[PDB]
Amino acid sequence: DVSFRLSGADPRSYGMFIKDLRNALPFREKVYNIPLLLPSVSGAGRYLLMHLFNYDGKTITVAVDVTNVYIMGYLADTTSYFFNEPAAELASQYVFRDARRKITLPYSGNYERLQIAAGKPREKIPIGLPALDSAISTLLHYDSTAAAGALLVLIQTTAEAARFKYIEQQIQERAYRDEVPSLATISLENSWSGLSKQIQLAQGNNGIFRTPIVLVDNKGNRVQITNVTSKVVTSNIQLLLNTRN
Ligand SMILES: Nc1ncnc2c1ncn2[C@@H]1O[C@H](COP(=O)(O)OP(=O)(O)O)[C@@H](O)[C@H]1O
Numbered sequence: 001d002v003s004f005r006l007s008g009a010d011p012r013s014y015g016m017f018i019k020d021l022r023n024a025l026p027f028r029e030k031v032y033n034i035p036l037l038l039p040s041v042s043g044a045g046r047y048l049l050m051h052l053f054n055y056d057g058k059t060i061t062v063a064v065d066v067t068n069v070y071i072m073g074y075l076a077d078t079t080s081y082f083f084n085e086p087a088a089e090l091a092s093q094y095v096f097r098d099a100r101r102k103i104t105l106p107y108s109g110n111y112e113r114l115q116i117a118a119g120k121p122r123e124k125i126p127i128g129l130p131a132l133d134s135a136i137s138t139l140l141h142y143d144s145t146a147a148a149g150a151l152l153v154l155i156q157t158t159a160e161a162a163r164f165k166y167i168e169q170q171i172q173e174r175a176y177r178d179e180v181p182s183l184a185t186i187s188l189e190n191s192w193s194g195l196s197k198q199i200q201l202a203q204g205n206n207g208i209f210r211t212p213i214v215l216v217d218n219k220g221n222r223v224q225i226t227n228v229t230s231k232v233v234t235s236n237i238q239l240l241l242n243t244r245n
């Protein structure tokens, strides 16, 4: 399992949690020095448990699919909550079995779907460590509209930070003050699958992308990624989604 405590959290402790999260995800190999997530994991081993504590010491346990860093669901006290998607229904056979009831949320974990359910796009939802304290507090007691926003904050501050060093650093900057995501943050989230595919295909194409990827850089400017010598590949991306997925 991995843990993060918002009480006494600072940029260093958040960075330690994200390092813990990345290191709990299994890989058999690296592509251009980046861990390659497994194509598949059978049974309970497919799920990682993340224990998150708000400033007040109240806790949720979040279940994460180690193939893609997707959040399946979470446990608050004696109630489990799962996204409305087949992988989450399967997860509910393995995790949070002892919960008194299991609520299926009225949406999948798809960003477009969560944004419709929250009533706001990611572009307008502040993120940061105080936002994560709020999100844990929201998820402790069911409110599906409130939960959609909380889950967009939770996914970006856990899974997306694990996938990109830049997003980790953006949340560290927001340790004590929330701010809507940077243009480069939204770009990287939207491009993880694409970048993962192009990095794996660059094995066999001399480190050249078969299809260049258009990103936003840390200054807010267009950068076109054509090959593996780019900073996005050498420093930023930390996990590759397997092209089998
Ligand atoms: N359960 C989930 N948890 C976290 N992020 C998710 C989840 N489901 C979808 N996403 C995100 O939403 C976007 C679209 O994903 P998507 O193509 O819908 O995957 P899938 O088809 O398996 O649901 C991606 O940015 C993706 O990372």
Ligand SMILES: *[C@@H]1O[C@H](CO)[C@@H](O)[C@H](O)[C@H]1NC(C)=O
Pocket: 226, 227, 228, 229, 230, 231
């Ligand atoms: C490869 O990507 C880098 C980005 O750092 C760029 O400088 C270079 O022009 C690209 N193309 C080739 C052919 O290396």
